Amino acid sequence: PQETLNGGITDMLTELANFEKNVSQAIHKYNAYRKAASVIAKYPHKIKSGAEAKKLPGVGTKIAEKIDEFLATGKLRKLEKIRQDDTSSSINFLTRVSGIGPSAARKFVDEGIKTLEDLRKNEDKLNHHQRIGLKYFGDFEKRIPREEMLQMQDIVLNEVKKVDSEYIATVCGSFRRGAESSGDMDVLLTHPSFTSESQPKLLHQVVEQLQKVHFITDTLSKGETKFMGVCQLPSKNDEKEYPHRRIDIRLIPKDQYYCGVLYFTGSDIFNKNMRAHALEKGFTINEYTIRPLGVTGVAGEPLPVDSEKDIFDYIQWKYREPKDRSE
DNA sequence: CCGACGTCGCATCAGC
DNA sequence: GCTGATGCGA
DNA sequence: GTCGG
Numbered sequence: 001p002q003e004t005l006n007g008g009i010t011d012m013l014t015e016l017a018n019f020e021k022n023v024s025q026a027i028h029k030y031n032a033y034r035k036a037a038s039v040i041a042k043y044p045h046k047i048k049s050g051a052e053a054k055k056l057p058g059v060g061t062k063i064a065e066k067i068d069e070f071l072a073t074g075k076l077r078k079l080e081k082i083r084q085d086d087t088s089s090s091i092n093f094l095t096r097v098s099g100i101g102p103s104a105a106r107k108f109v110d111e112g113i114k115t116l117e118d119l120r121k122n123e124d125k126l127n128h129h130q131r132i133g134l135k136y137f138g139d140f141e142k143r144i145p146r147e148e149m150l151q152m153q154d155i156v157l158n159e160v161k162k163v164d165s166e167y168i169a170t171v172c173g174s175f176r177r178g179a180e181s182s183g184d185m186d187v188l189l190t191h192p193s194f195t196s197e198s199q200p201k202l203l204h205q206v207v208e209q210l211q212k213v214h215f216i217t218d219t220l221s222k223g224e225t226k227f228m229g230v231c232q233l234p235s236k237n238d239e240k241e242y243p244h245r246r247i248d249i250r251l252i253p254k255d256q257y258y259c260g261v262l263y264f265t266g267s268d269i270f271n272k273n274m275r276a277h278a279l280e281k282g283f284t285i286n287e288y289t290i291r292p293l294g295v296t297g298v299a300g301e302p303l304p305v306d307s308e309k310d311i312f313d314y315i316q317w318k319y320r321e322p323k324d325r326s327e
Numbered sequence: 328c329c330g331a332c333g334t335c336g337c338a339t340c341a342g343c
Numbered sequence: 344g345c346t347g348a349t350g351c352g353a
Numbered sequence: 354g355t356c357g358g
C-alpha cells in the first residue's frame with residue numbers, strides 16, 4: 001500500500017521482532033514477527049481487527065491478540081514495559097553496533113557497559129570488528145546516494161582492471177537493482193584462473209590496491225574468497241569529508257559467475273521466493289549452482305549456466321530485470 | 328503434540 | 344599446537 | 354510465533 005496504512009502495527013511487530021532476536025535470543029520468534037510485519041505491510045486495507053489480520057499467512061492467534069490491544073489502546077503493555085527496562089533496552093541498542101550481536105550485547109550490559117560512551121571507555125573488551133563498528137557507528141547508519149555509488153564503482157572498476165585487466169568486477173546488491181540509494185556496496189570478483197575445478201592471491205591483490213589509493217580504509221574480515229571492510233570516496237581540496245561506507249568484495253569461481261551475480265543481486269526477499277518456486281519445480285538454487293531435484297528430493301549435478309535467464313528458464317519463470325527484483 | 332524455521336565465509340572461543 | 348563449535352553479518 | 358506433518 002503506502003507504508004503508513006498499517007504502519008503502527010508493522011512498527012509494533014518490528015520492535016517485537018528486535019527484542020526477540022537481541023534480548024530473548026529467540027531467532028525463530030524474530031522471523032515470525034518479521035514475516036507477519038511483511039505480509040501486513042503489503043495488505044491493501046486498513047486492518048480493523050486481529051481476526052481480520054489473522055486471515056493472512058504468518059499471522060496467528062498471539063499476534064491477532066496484540067493487534068486487538070493496539071487498536072483498542074494505541075499501545076502494547078509488554079512493549080511499553082520493556083522499553084523502560086534499562087537492561088533490555090540497553091542490550092537491544094548495543095546490537096546496533098556492527099560486530100556486537102545478541103550475545104556480546106548481553107555480556108557488555110551484564111558488566112555495566114550499556115552505552116556508546118561505555119564502549120569508548122572500554123576498547124580492551126572489544127574485538128577488531130566491534131571497534132570499527134563503534135568508530136563508524138553513525139556513518140554505517142547513513143545511506144549512500146546513487147551518485148556516490150557510481151563514483152565508488154568508478155574507482156573499483158578502475159583499480160581492479162589496473163591490477164589485472166582480466167578480472168571482472170560487478171557491483172551487485174541494491175545498486176545493480178538500480179536503487180536511488182544503498183546501505184552499502186557489494187562487489188563480485190571473477191578471474192579466469194579461479195574456477196570450481198581450480199594464481200594464489202587473487203582477492204588480496206584487489207584489496208591491497210584499493211588500500212593503496214586510499215579507497216579502503218579498514219578491514220573487518222578478510223579471507224581468500226570474502227572481504228568485508230570500510231571504504232571512503234576522496235574529497236576535494238576544501239570540501240567536507242565523505243562518510244565512511246561498508247563494502248564487501250567476493251571472489252567467485254568464473255564458471256559460477258551468474259549464480260553468484262543472481263544470488264548477491266537479490267533482493268534477499270526476491271531470492272527467498274525465487275529459490276522457493278524452484279523447490280516446487282524440482283530444482284534448487286544456491287549461490288554456486290542450480291541443481292535438479294531427483295524424485296526423492298535429492299539434488300543431482302550442477303547444470304550449465306551461461307546467463308542469468310538460463311536460471312530463470314529452468315524454473316518456469318519469465319526473466320526479470322534486476323530493477324524488478326525488489327521481491 | 329511437536330519439529331521446522333536457508334545457507335555461507337570468517338573471527339573467535341572451547342576443549343583436547 | 345590442533346579441531347570442532349559458536350558468534351556474527353549477510 | 355506460526356505452520357503443518
Ligand SMILES: Nc1nc2c(ncn2[C@H]2C[C@H](O)[C@@H](COP(=O)(O)NP(=O)(O)OP(=O)(O)O)O2)c(=O)[nH]1
Nearest residue numbers: 173174181182183184186263264265266267268353
Ligand atoms: N544468504 C543471505 N543473503 C542475503 C541476506 N540478506 C541479503 N542477502 C544476499 C542478498 C542481498 O540483497 C544481498 C547483497 O547484500 P546486501 O548489501 O546486505 N543487501 P542489498 O544490497 O539488497 O541491500 P542494501 O542496499 O541495504 O545494501 O546478498 C540474507 O539474510 N541471507
Ligand SMILES: [Mg+2]
Nearest residue numbers: 173174184186
Ligand atoms: Mg548492498
Ligand SMILES: [Mg+2]
Nearest residue numbers: 184185186248
Ligand atoms: Mg552488503
Ligand code: NA
Nearest residue numbers: 054055056059
Ligand atoms: Na493466519
Ligand code: NA
Nearest residue numbers: 095097098100
Ligand atoms: Na550488531
